[PDB]
Design an enzyme around this catalytic site. Sequence first.
Site, short mmCIF file in Angstrom:
data_model
loop_
_atom_site.label_atom_id
_atom_site.label_comp_id
_atom_site.label_asym_id
_atom_site.label_seq_id
_atom_site.Cartn_x
_atom_site.Cartn_y
_atom_site.Cartn_z
CD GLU A 58 76.24 113.57 -52.69
OE1 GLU A 58 75.96 112.38 -52.83
OE2 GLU A 58 75.82 114.24 -51.72
CD1 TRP A 80 75.07 117.70 -51.20
CD2 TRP A 80 75.55 117.78 -49.02
NE1 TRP A 80 75.69 116.54 -50.87
CE2 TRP A 80 75.99 116.56 -49.53
CE3 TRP A 80 75.71 118.05 -47.66
CZ2 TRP A 80 76.61 115.59 -48.72
CZ3 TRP A 80 76.35 117.10 -46.86
CH2 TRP A 80 76.79 115.89 -47.40
NE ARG A 166 78.91 108.65 -39.16
CZ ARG A 166 77.92 109.46 -38.85
NH1 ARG A 166 77.02 109.09 -37.96
NH2 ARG A 166 77.84 110.66 -39.41
CG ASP A 169 66.71 106.80 -44.05
OD1 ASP A 169 65.91 105.83 -44.00
OD2 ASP A 169 66.36 107.95 -44.37
#
Lengths: 264, 264
Positions: A58, A80, A166, A169
């Site tokens: 990634e 993704w 921002r 999890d």
Amino acid sequence: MKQYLELMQKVLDEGTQKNDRTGTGTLSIFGHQMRFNLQDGFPLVTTKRCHLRSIIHELLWFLQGDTNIAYLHENNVTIWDEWADENGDLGPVYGKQWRAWPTPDGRHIDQITTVLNQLKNDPDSERIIVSAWNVGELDKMALAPCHAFFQFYVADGKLSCQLYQRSCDVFLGLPFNIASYALLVHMMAQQCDLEVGDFVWTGGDTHLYSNHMDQTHLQLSREPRPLPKLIIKRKPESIFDYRFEDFEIEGYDPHPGIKAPVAI
Amino acid sequence: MKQYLELMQKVLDEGTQKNDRTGTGTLSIFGHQMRFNLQDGFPLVTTKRCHLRSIIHELLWFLQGDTNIAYLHENNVTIWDEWADENGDLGPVYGKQWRAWPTPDGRHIDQITTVLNQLKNDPDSERIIVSAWNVGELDKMALAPCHAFFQFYVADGKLSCQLYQRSCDVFLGLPFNIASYALLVHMMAQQCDLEVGDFVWTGGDTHLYSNHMDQTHLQLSREPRPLPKLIIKRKPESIFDYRFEDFEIEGYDPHPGIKAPVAI
């Protein structure tokens, strides 16, 4: 990792009951900060097994300014997929802003390179920043940037970095984001002949999902193992010439993985 | 304020010797976070006297999307003069991005209003963000945003806010930035029928100037006085209809002001 488990606990302890956009309930706190001394060791959580593989691809993918999942698929990386459109298109996400933030005047700004220039010719700058929060393209993105903003800092030949995330999890994503950025700084530093400093992680809405409670307790009961050590087996001519194989993690002996289903 | 003096001390204690762009030396640390419970009281530093006046006008000015200093001059506010061009033009700074972030496709995005909509129709959002870091216009700004990025958060009818400040002069500017944003949240909240939550301040390059040492010790020797209380004497029809006079601070009994010259 000590810092991680602390966060975990805190949210358990102080999280208030917010509902996520799916309707899945969260335990959330707002505003958290945690530092990792990169020389101390590579911050890959050990209290549960984690797989770097897809993390590396990634990163390499972002660096290419690619927003289609083709490259990821070539390496059988499917994180993704959940978001991609009928053609593997994600929209002007991360990779795009990093490397080709578009201006109203017809330019594509490559913030990665800008940053590299700064680190080499002006390490004392207070504006060595990369932002993925392009207000104008938010609407075209599959999803808005979670880790939307980062800043580098140089002091005593030590490159450091602060990430503003921002939304978080704690269980599923945090671990992965930490390793990802820490990886970035190592490459960045190698490329600038600087030693790694700290990685500072700053979160906004930091949460645990209600259906991740047992796994949390479960994880909270484990004892962190020594941090592994990242090794870059080679030095490319540029930040864009890194290959999946240049990296190798040594000394990682994590406890067993823990699965956390998600709702839909 | 307790939190402030702590920061002060820390930088004294851990700041390393970086040089600023002028060549003036700093004592800097990278990455700091501090929270202020807005219900506790209005965070205006008391260990030294501070003047809200110019803080209020500036805020009102940003909210209008104005980038010329005319309005400030009308009220004899000169904090922006040092930067303005021959016509009072500052470039697409704060005010401009807040209210009319320009898109490559010909639009002007008003993030202030967007935000207000979110707070009213989706308080649970994890993307109630305002960014002033417009990569494309950086070059046209008199100076790049210091407080470049902020996020709001709602929980239990309490609006909270985190500001990311990439560069900081602890002595001169911090105090002022704190009050400024805290003011913003009060207005924001009034307008959304929410009670004020916390104001979280996050800094990148946080520093003290070498020529501010005595004043630091001097200030560090004082004892914080009770926080004053902000009062909004009225409720406008919009966030853009606030007047300088709607505000009034009560209970502020600060110690004497402390001057800190700067180099050039």
